[PDB]
């Protein structure tokens, strides 16, 4: 048993989101001849205990960057029609961490750590303007760093096992609700469970009691909390996960999951039951067979795949064909896309899950003449 502060290891560079705007960095806002375009940084995320770093050079050694406002992560901007220096606490952010690490001799490292406790989407801006610098009648470039924190769409589990109450969330379970010294947890899909305990085992939350390991790869060991991310897609309702003596057992509520896909599989022993099942080798090898996947939902919580054998080109769904390959997140423009890798006997099954709401229309293609085109509309 150990405290969960160092249970999430000591691997540095977990920042991720880093809107770098510095002179030595390659996204510089200096006036230059090779580039004459402003730089953007747009982030949409379900922000779970990560951090955002702004590496910005200071006002010393000539006033370089007009940071608007001057205390960016202490006071942050609203929409541009009503740009006032609103405080960081007025938005609705719950249990944040702000670090104005200026102790490095080259930049103002402004870091914000955001917990997912919010009842609404929180959008904020910090401008970095250098149009005051005129060199050879060519002005500087502007940045409009825009972070749009999104609410977690699934439900969140948070029980009580510590002395100090917090009450940022409606309390579900407690030690008085610990029925028969065993917690039976029924997650739906992809939720997170927060046991407020300060002493958990070193190799717990990584195995299972009945069979296999009901787990994903985003288990977060906070200094005062303990949160694991449930996987979006599981095999059957026969696996579980337990850690501990207060014994908490977590098992998924596996219903009959439906995944959209062409699924030209040859093996009948396939655990994934897709929508379409049209064969590939049944037809002759001269026709241009095309598979269309049209997606139109207001709130996407979907999971699309394929089960055709042979060779899958390109590496779907990491890079997909242009409507000539391009990344899936570059066309969808939404983060939090899960991907599952399957190593079967004969048929190759690949699947990805998208949660959120896309701004624009993307119609990407994966070729198994068998072509599978997946189109998702802006709506």
């Amino acid at each position: 048993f150990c405290k969960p502060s160092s249970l999430n290891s000591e691997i540095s560079g977990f920042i991720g989101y880093k809107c770098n705007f510095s002179n030595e960095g390659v996204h510089n806002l200096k006036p230059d001849m090779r580039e004459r375009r402003s730089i953007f940084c747009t982030i949409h995320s379900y922000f779970i205990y990560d951090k955002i770093r702004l590496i910005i050079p200071k006002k010393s050694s000539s006033p370089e960057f007009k940071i608007l406002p001057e205390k960016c992560f202490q006071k942050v901007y609203t929409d541009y029609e009503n740009r006032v220096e609103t405080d960081i606490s007025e938005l609705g952010l719950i249990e944040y961490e702000i670090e104005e690490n200026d102790t490095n001799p080259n930049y103002n490292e402004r870091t914000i750590t955001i917990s997912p406790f919010s009842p609404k989407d929180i959008e904020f801006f910090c401008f970095c303007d250098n149009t005051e610098k005129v060199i050879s009648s060519i002005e500087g470039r502007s940045a409009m760093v825009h972070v749009r924190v999104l609410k977690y769409p699934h439900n969140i589990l948070f029980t009580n096992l510590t002395n100090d109450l917090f009450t940022y969330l409606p309390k579900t379970y407690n030690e008085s609700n610990f029925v028969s010294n065993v917690l039976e947890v029924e997650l739906n899909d992809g939720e997170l469970f927060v046991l407020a305990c300060e002493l958990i085992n070193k190799k717990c939350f990584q195995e299972g009691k009945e069979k296999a390991l009901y787990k994903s790869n985003k288990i977060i060991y906070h200094k005062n909390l303990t949160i694991f991310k449930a996987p979006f897609y599981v095999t059957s309702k026969d696996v579980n996960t337990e850690c501990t003596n207060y014994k908490i057992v977590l098992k998924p509520k596996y219903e009959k999951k439906v995944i959209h896909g062409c699924n030209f599989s040859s093996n009948v022993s396939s655990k994934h039951t897709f929508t379409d099942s049209l064969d590939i080798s049944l037809v002759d090898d001269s026709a241009h067979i095309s598979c269309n996947v049209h997606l139109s939902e207001p709130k996407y919580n979907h999971l699309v795949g394929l089960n055709c054998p042979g060779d899958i080109i390109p590496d779907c769904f990491f890079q997909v064909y242009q409507p000539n390959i391009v990344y899936l997140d570059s066309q969808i423009n939404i983060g939090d896309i899960e991907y599952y890798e399957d190593a079967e006997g004969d048929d190759k099954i690949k699947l990805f899950g998208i949660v959120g709401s896309i701004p624009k229309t993307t119609s990407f293609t994966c070729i198994c003449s068998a072509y599978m085109t997946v189109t998702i509309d802006s709506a």
Partner: protein
């Protein structure tokens, strides 16, 4: 007996000792003891007539260069053994105005003992001349740092097959004199250490500098080592010069006022001699430096590295100056204006090869406030940079501030005094050079020949440059201070511009401050303006530099002296340019076709022709604007002279040829090149085939600019050129773009389309392999690529050859010269993070190769490849130690000293990882991420394919920025190991530790920062 010897002291001048027995009446063989009191770094040069024979009898041969002396034991030994590390023992043959003779040259090393070299001259046998070189002890034991690679504990002469490097490190303080000695067969690397060194680290203290720091750091380009170069080259071409071209050369020691004494780019025969090098630190050294020089044998590939870091290692006592504010002045690019196209460029671009001559102004005359001292603080100085990147056939005009009616004083032509009475021709190894004598006490120097082979100027030339800038009583100051834009500083070397950039014409421009608005002779100190025109054919990519600073005081004090740096990079654009060179007839580059005293040049549309003639020695003074418009039947093609051209017509070229632009301004003293742009179309209504437009040159040679009728008829078949549709093939499982456009640029068959374009849209971790032929095939004798250096440069905005690292930082480029079929393979891989959308192109062209088969002529085609690289938002979860790669990697640290750092990252399946270090760092192990330091078997060498047979790996040691990148991605492996790599330097050590766990991934932020560019 002292009375029996005709004792004479050596002639000491400009730290050069001369014993001239040839044409000096004091040293005459009619009786000779030439005693030289040889101090530190003194050149001993001996002159002699042709003989009688020497007692160390040296015959003139290429393989016979073992210069012998006599030691203290009266044994005829080598001079490399009698003097402990001598350098520069050469035998030359010199002719003065007809009279022939030979000479012996060497230098003096620092020795901790007393030695004496005796050169005995004999006659057919009496004793005639006794050159007694007395070299007394000049260094102590503690003031002489050395690493011999010939003996001791650092001997490579008994090196085995397993170990091959005896690395040495001896530290240097202020006032030290140090060097490096190589064994036989082992050349000094790079050429002329220590004026050429392989730099690793240099920290500058402000209190050390007695002048202003005139050093160009390039792109912070510290040099490589030969151990990391030869792994990525070709097979046969592995000589010393190719490895020196692939490793980078730096000359920081000459700018840091080290007494560097070496041979320049004219070294000794390394297969028969110990190549030795020395350098003396300044007496006010409180700085931290780190470099390396090598003893390298390019047959067995054995190297010795003398990594010298200095004595000081504390980085708190270094007084980093706060008085320097660094400012930016980007140069201005304008469209081409010729006093009527100024309005035409204004009208047409508002509604939107004359577009390939873009005009450049770097205006420091107008922007003097960036080199003016601010009144907010008097102690603050300013430093300004101006980076210019331009292609061939361009025009660039430099403006720097000046004093009005400035008189450049003529002490430099007074110190030149170039006559024919000083002429001495010196030949060694059947290679000739021309040198002069200083007319004070009949003194010359072979150090001037080494300086001429290194700096490009003479010894008195360099001394007068330094004294002209040091005695600068004016306010505004320049580097180089005399003859600006006729001398430029490229790679810290003051050399002539038109000698290096061969074929540069000094253009005319309007002088600011004058109301005449007349384009006259413009010189940068005089009028504050100087214009030049880039030649059409550039051999390699070059980069020269200028400085024009302003000091508030009248002296270069450096406590108030500002500086303006102009950084012009000229890219190599390679086409075929026609003309008639008259210098290759009589190494010197020729950029002309030379269709051989009667010169025939065919007028082709959309090209530039050129005559290399002296400016006023040719009979028409405006020859390219004039014309000897005469029929071909009038001129006898066999028996003719230039005098009958005196009886010819002199119509102007602006009357016959419609808009043929003749660029020739021969009023300058040093113009040797004249050019003419031939227009887009020709007409037979004004031109007959017999009617040619001839000139002559120097009353002996003649040029005929006739037009052939079949050459005009071959233009008239061009009616269709469409765009290809994704015919560059893509292996999407392996993600390799294979391009085979060899048959389309082949001129052996009939082709419908002359120009086609192929569009490729790539992503990160994708390979691009293009097969393109060379100029040793059939139907490919005039094949050229665009740009010429495809390993470093691409084509930005479809015509400008730009560096690839400034748009795609970390591209993997490799050219393989397949000599089994004489083709070339281009292999380019995108780094896993792409920070922006990048477009460029690479063109191949064989339009100048001819196929005349069955009395039918067919030319080649044009094939250019469009390359689009997408927005690689996937960040690399690695450990960077370079600082500038914060966009690629997550953990980013500037390479601060004493940074013994550990980075820990655990990866899994289908996830990118890697590292970046600086390229000059000691990589441990050799070729990291291939044979890793496995930690689960307690940090020992294990190949990655042994541990994991389904990994992908890439590693590039040095791009143009100067960094080492490596990437690994694991695909479907389920073992458990742990592996580390250590970038170890002489001041800091970094370690990256990656853990392989299949079911454990780093907890992801699950999105990426979308960098977008709007307009």
């Amino acid at each position: 007996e002292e009375e029996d010897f005709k004792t004479a002291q050596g002639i000491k001048h400009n730290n050069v000792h001369l014993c001239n027995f040839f044409d000096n009446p004091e040293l005459t063989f009619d009786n000779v003891l030439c005693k030289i009191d040889a101090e530190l770094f003194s050149e001993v040069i001996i002159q002699l007539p042709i003989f009688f024979s020497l007692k160390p009898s040296l015959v003139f041969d290429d393989n016979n260069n073992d210069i012998k002396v006599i030691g203290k034991e009266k044994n005829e030994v080598s001079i490399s053994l009698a003097l402990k590390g001598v350098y520069g023992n050469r035998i030359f043959t010199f002719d003065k105005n007809g009279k022939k003779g030979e000479g012996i040259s060497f230098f003096i090393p620092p020795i901790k003992q007393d030695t004496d070299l005796k050169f005995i001259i004999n006659e057919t046998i009496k004793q005639r001349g006794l050159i007694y070189i007395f070299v007394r002890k000049n260094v102590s034991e503690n003031s002489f740092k050395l690493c011999d690679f010939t003996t001791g504990s650092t001997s490579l002469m008994e090196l085995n097959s397993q170990v091959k490097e005896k690395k040495c490190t001896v530290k240097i303080k202020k006032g030290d004199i140090f060097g490096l000695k190589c064994p036989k067969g082992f050349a000094i690397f790079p050429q002329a250490c220590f004026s050429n060194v392989l730099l690793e680290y240099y920290k500058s203290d402000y209190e050390d500098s007695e002048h202003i720091n005139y050093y160009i750091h390039k792109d912070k380009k510290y040099n490589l080592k030969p151990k990391d170069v030869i792994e990525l080259m070709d097979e046969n071409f592995r000589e010393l010069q190719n490895i020196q071209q692939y490793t980078g050369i730096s000359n920081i020691t000459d700018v840091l006022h080290f007494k560097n004494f070496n041979l320049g780019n004219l070294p000794l025969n390394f297969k028969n001699h110990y190549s030795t090098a020395y350098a003396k630190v300044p007496d006010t050294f409180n700085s931290i430096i780190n470099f390396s020089c090598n003893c390298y044998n390019p047959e067995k590939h054995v190297y010795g590295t003398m990594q010298v870091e200095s004595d000081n290692r504390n980085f708190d006592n270094i007084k980093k100056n706060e008085n320097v504010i660094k400012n930016f002045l980007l140069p201005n690019i304008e469209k081409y204006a010729l006093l009527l196209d100024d309005e035409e460029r204004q009208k047409k671009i508002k509604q939107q090869i004359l577009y390939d001559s873009n005009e450049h102004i770097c205006d420091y005359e107008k922007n003097e406030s960036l080199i003016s001292t601010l009144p907010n603080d008097t102690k603050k100085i300013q430093k300004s940079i101006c980076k210019i990147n331009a292609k061939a056939l361009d025009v660039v005009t430099i403006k720097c501030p000046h004093t009005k009616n400035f008189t450049p004083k003529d002490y430099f032509p007074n110190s030149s005094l170039i006559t024919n009475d000083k002429k001495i021709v010196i030949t060694f190894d059947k290679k000739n050079f021309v040198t002069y004598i200083d007319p004070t006490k009949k003194t010359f120097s072979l150090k001037d020949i080494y300086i001429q082979s290194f700096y490009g100027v003479s010894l008195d030339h360099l001394n007068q440059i330094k004294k002209i800038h040091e005695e600068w009583d004016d306010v505004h100051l320049f580097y180089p201070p005399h003859n600006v834009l006729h001398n430029v500083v490229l790679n810290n070397h003051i050399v002539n511009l038109s000698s290096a950039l061969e074929g540069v014409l000094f253009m005319k421009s309007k002088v600011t401050g004058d109301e005449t608005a007349t384009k006259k002779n413009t010189t940068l100190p005089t009028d504050g303006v100087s214009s030049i025109l880039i030649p059409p054919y550039v051999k390699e990519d070059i980069t020269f530099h200028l400085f024009c600073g302003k000091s508030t005081t009248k002296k270069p004090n450096k406590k108030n002296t500002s500086l303006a740096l102009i950084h012009i990079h000229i890219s190599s654009n390679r086409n075929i340019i026609h003309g008639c060179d008259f210098l290759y007839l009589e190494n010197s580059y020729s950029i002309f076709t030379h269709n051989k005293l009667i010169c025939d040049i065919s007028l082709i549309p959309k090209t530039v022709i050129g005559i290399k003639c002296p400016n006023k020695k040719l009979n028409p003074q405006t020859c390219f604007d004039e014309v000897y418009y005469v029929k071909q039947e009038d001129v006898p093609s066999k028996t003719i002279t230039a005098d009958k051209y005196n009886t010819f017509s002199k119509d102007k070229i602006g009357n016959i040829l419609k808009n043929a632009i003749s660029i020739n301004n021969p009023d300058e003293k040093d113009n040797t090149y004249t050019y003419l742009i031939l227009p887009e179309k020709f007409e037979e209504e004004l031109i007959d085939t017999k009617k040619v437009l001839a000139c002559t040159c120097d009353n002996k040679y003649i040029i005929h600019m006739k037009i052939e009728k079949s050459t005009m008829d071959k233009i008239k078949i061009d009616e269709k050129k469409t765009i290809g549709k994704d015919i560059c093939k893509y292996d999407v499982t392996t993600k390799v773009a294979t391009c085979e456009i060899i048959d389309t640029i082949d001129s052996s068959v009939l082709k419908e389309h002359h120009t086609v374009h192929y569009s490729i849209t790539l992503s990160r971790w994708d390979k691009l392999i293009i097969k393109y032929p060379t100029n040793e095939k059939t139907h490919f004798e005039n094949f050229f690529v665009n740009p010429f250096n495809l390993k470093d440069k691409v084509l930005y905005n479809y015509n400008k050859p730009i560096n690839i690292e400034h748009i795609l930082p970390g591209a993997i480029t490799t050219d393989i010269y397949d000599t089994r079929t004489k083709i070339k393979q281009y292999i380019l891989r995108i780094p896993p993070y792409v920070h922006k959308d990048i477009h460029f192109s690479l063109e191949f062209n064989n339009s100048l190769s001819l196929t005349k088969q069955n009395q039918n002529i067919i030319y080649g085609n044009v094939a250019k490849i469009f390359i689009h690289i997408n927005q690689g938002y996937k960040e690399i979860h690695g450990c960077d130690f370079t600082g500038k790669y914060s966009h690629l990697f997550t953990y980013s640290k500037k390479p601060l000293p004493n940074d013994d750092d550990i980075c820990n990252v655990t990866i899994g399946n289908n996830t990118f990882s890697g590292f970046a270090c600086l390229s000059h760092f000691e990589l441990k192990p050799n070729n990291c991420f291939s044979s890793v330091y496995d930690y689960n078997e307690a940090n020992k060498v294990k190949k990655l394919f042994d541990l994991s047979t389904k990994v992908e790996l890439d590693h590039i040691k040095q791009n143009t920025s100067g960094y080492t990148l490596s990437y690994i991605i694991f695909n479907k492996e389920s073992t458990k190991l742990k592996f580390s790599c250590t970038c170890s330097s002489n001041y800091s050590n970094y370690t990256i530790r990656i853990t392989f766990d299949p079911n454990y991934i780093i907890p992801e932020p699950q999105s990426r920062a979308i960098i977008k560019y709007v307009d």
